[PDB]
Design a protein around this ligand. Structure first.
Ligand SMILES: [Mg+2]
Length: 832
RNA sequence: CACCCGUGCAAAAAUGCAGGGGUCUAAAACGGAUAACCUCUCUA
RNA sequence: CAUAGAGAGGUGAUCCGC
């Protein structure tokens, strides 16, 4: 990024008439380095400072870094932000000018600093990412109905954790038509075989059998409420719902526990098997502590390598000491290939239980050493020490680890008491907080890449929150949250939970015994419509991790009709590297890369086998190419949709803050553009914005983004072209993924696909055409639809018309309306 | 290759130069390798 | 007929290499 980070400036904070500077501690920890009053400074961290101040000025501070490869950098004084070249110093606002309201929301008072708002914006990013993956999860559940109804039924949208199943079953005989249809919708859902795609959530190994209705309902109700709370903005106490999950009724806690216990128990039991003999031998050779603490330590050192602190090749030291001894030979058969690794733990305990002075002297020598020659000499002396002082006990290991003794000990266990054993490995539900269990439930419906992105984003944002909460203690600032957000005072615990979650969370497998139902989908995803070949194709499809995504987020024969779109196929296989195109074509065919792409783009469209040796590998080559192409396409469209889900989430959230700040924002459900009009200070009359542009409006625009006349005038001009109904149906298309559901109709006629932005917006614009074709449409929307039929490509004007709700955040509006600005990975020229 | 802020130098209207931005955008830093187990297909 | 004797393909836990 920047020289300030390279110099080690982790942050610069303002606190009244004082400025504080920080550097990177261990991990994401911050340490205080300097304070500036005015043109004058005082050092901190005096025993290991990361950088020094070369000269301090009111414009900015110059620094030189000791912490690494030395660089010289300059950093700008936060108090002169917005105050250079025309009261000359002030604590900066956020761009939205919501800082006083956000501070008065999460904490009780306005704070006169800019440390609190960074924490708050991390809280807002946690909700931002949950709105995305909860929307994806509910879409994945709703897709199960797509073979029976095209509509996104309300059954998932209305659910709340207020109604327990015992007052919902009362609807079975209720007289009210909607409540009856709601229960018959639940009965229709629980009978669908496609629950087998989510076996880890809905099935219990007890063959594995479908759970009792009360738990299926409680799962659906939890995920539905999580979506409703993320995508809408709640009123009253429901706003605090995610932060008051301790208040959930017993059925939801019990279902969360019984879902979370099945991965934990499995992994907490595998380790008690693959290790029995090793743990017993260690528990005999060592007697120095309660054996549960030995087992804890062995688990900890096996699963966490501690290289973030013990950052040196202890394994090289081991080899340097054991080389040339029988310990490096077939002295006994048991460990010539594997099973050797407790020797490392013997070394590790030889560092933890004693000679920690030598370990600290080693860590110092490793900091002071210059050459690999030095580290090698030190390793040789450590080998000379350890091989005489402590290693002799491994001879008793060599006595204990004989093969028949291994076989005997395999019939035995460590005899830790059950309630102690269950507290020396991965914690069970009883200990894990409801938030992490609900995150695990959400992850049950997601792809592995989505699980990784979600969990690591949560880890990062909680670690940031923790770091700021630590900073505020040393600075002596008021840290105490409002009572309703006191959840975040446990954030250091939740980070420890989330990093534990990342240690075992994994993609939802299918039921192994269920595959004979997926067979029909596995054939209908290709369009194959003697039996051994068909069974082989089915088995080589159902095992594919790409099929497991593609059939959960899409209807298979709808994917097969989508694969007839030669332009989109040709585009997505243009982005496959040429060497991969060779690796496919050499396997599928038995000469330019363009003509080979074109040929396999026709092969993948006419793909079939039949009417309902290496040949098998040829068949795999055809299958693996096909599923890969569609996987890349649909994933990226879903990833484009998430960006607009965030945008509408923000529209909902910031409206309530702008309303809370005193702006007459109006009804955001009647017209999503009301906030932008409110921020622009313009008001509709008779359905038209009458006002022309004037500088006096921009100079009074309610946020910093809209202060500039150029983009204010452009947003006003595009907003006069918007239409209420089209923006609302765009919003619902985004929140329901209807554009991706109806992909075989929206994609029917495209000339060319330039990028996934153009494809996604063609899908939306053709959906809006299909929704408004039978309705009265006003002038500019009719022109946009005309240009959408004259050119079989998305209208660049229409997207910047219907995206006008986001205009209040100019950076978001630009990013979501100009391609090449859209994707971090594919930069390009902006227009206008 | 977006937005915003600082500074130097042009300039009276906006350009250039070099930086900063957890308080901006999703957007601060932060190859196979053997063995073991299930599943499918093909002979006798 | 089913289960059995070699192949052969694939998914998911993984021990080291310049
Ligand atoms: Mg941010």
């Amino acid at each position: 990024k920047s020289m300030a980070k390279a110099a080690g400036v982790k942050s610069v904070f303002a606190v009244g008439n004082t400025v504080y500077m920080t550097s990177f501690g261990r991990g994401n920890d911050a340490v205080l380095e300097q304070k500036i009053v005015d043109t004058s400074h005082e050092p901190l961290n005096i025993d290991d400072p990361a950088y020094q101040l070369n000269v301090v000025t009111m414009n900015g501070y110059s620094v030189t870094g000791h912490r690494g490869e030395t660089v010289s950098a300059v950093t700008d004084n936060p108090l002169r932000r917005f105050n250079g070249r025309k009261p000359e110093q002030s604590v900066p606002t956020d761009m939205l000018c919501l800082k006083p309201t956000l501070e008065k929301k999460f904490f009780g008072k306005e704070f006169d600093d800019n440390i609190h708002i960074q924490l708050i914006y991390n809280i807002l990013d946690i909700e931002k990412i949950l709105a995305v993956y909860s929307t994806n999860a509910i879409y994945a559940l709703n897709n199960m109905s797509a073979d029976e109804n095209i509509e996104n039924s309300d059954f998932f949208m209305k659910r709340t954790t207020d109604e327990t199943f015992d007052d919902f079953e009362k609807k079975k005989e209720s007289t009210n038509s909607r409540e009856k249809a709601d229960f018959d919708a639940f009965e229709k859902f629980i009978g669908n075989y496609r629950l087998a795609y989510f076996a880890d959530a809905f099935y219990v190994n007890k063959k594995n059998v479908l759970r009792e209705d009360k738990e299926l309902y409680s799962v659906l109700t939890l995920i539905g409420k999580l979506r409703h709370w993320c995508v809408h903005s709640e009123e009253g106490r429901a706003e605090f719902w995610l932060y008051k999950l301790d208040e959930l009724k017993d059925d939801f806690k019990n279902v969360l526990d019984v879902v979370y216990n099945r991965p934990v128990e499995e992994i907490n039991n595998r380790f008690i098997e693959n290790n029995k003999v090793n743990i017993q031998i260690l528990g005999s050779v060592y007697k120095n502590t309660d054996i549960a603490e030995l087992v804890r330590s062995y688990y900890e050192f096996l699963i966490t390598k501690k290289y973030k602190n013990m950052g040196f090749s202890i394994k090289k030291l081991r080899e340097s000491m054991l080389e040339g001894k029988g310990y490096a030979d077939k002295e006994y058969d048991s460990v010539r290939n594997k099973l050797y690794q407790m020797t490392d733990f013997i070394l590790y305990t030889g560092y933890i239980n004693e000679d920690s002075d030598r370990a600290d002297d080693l860590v110092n020598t490793l900091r002071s050493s210059l050459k690999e020659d030095d580290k090698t000499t030190v390793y040789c002396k450590e080998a000379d020490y350890l091989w005489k002082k402590y290693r002799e006990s491994i001879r008793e290991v060599a006595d204990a680890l004989d093969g028949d003794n291994i076989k005997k000990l395999s019939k035995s266990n460590i005899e830790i008491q059950e309630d102690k054993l269950r507290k020396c490995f991965i914690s069970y539900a009883d200990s894990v907080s409801e938030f992490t269990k609900l995150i695990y439930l959400l992850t049950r419906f997601l792809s592995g890449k989505e699980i990784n992105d979600l969990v690591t984003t949560l880890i990062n944002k909680f670690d940031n929150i923790r770091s700021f909460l630590e900073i505020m203690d040393e600075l002596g600032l008021d840290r105490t949250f409002t009572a309703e957000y006191s959840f975040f005072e446990g954030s250091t615990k939740y980070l420890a939970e989330l990093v534990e979650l990342n240690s075992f969370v994994k993609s939802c497998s299918f039921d192994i015994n269920a595959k004979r139902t997926m067979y029909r989908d596995a054939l209908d995803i290709l369009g194959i419509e003697n039996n051994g070949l068909r069974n082989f194709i089915a088995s080589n499809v159902i095992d594919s991790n790409r099929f497991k995504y593609l059939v959960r987020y899409g209807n298979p024969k709808k994917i097969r009709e989508t694969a007839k779109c030669k332009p989109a196929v040709r585009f997505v296989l243009n982005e496959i590297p040429d060497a991969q195109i060779e690796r496919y074509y050499e396997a599928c065919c038995p000469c330019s890369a363009n003509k080979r792409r074109e040929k396999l783009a026709d092969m993948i469209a006419e793909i079939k086998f039949e009417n309902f040796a290496e040949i098998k590998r040829k068949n795999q080559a055809i299958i693996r190419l096909y599923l890969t192409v569609m996987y890349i396409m649909l994933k990226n469209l879903v990833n484009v949709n998430a960006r607009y889900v965030i945008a509408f989430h923000c529209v909902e959230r910031d409206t309530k803050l702008y309303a809370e700040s005193g702006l007459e924002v109006g009804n955001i459900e009647k017209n999503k553009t009301n906030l932008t009009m409110a921020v622009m200070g313009v008001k509709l009359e008779n359905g038209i914005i009458k006002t022309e542009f004037d500088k006096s409006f921009a100079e009074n625009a309610a946020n910093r983004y809209l202060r500039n006349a150029r983009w204010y005038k452009l947003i006003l001009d595009n907003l006069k072209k918007s239409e209420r109904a089209v923006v609302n149906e765009f919003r619902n298309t985004v929140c329901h993924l209807n554009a991706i559901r109806n992909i075989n109709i929206n994609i029917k006629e495209i000339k060319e696909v330039e990028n996934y932005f153009a494809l996604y917006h063609y899908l939306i614009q053709k959906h809006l055409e299909n929704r408004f074709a039978d309705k009265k449409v006003e002038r500019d929307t009719g022109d946009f639809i005309s240009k959408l039929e004259e050119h079989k490509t998305y209208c660049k004007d229409f997207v910047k018309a219907y995206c006008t709700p986001f205009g209040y955040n100019l950076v978001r509006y630009k990013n979501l309306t100009i391609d090449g600005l859209f994707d971090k990975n594919y930069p390009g020229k902006d227009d206008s």
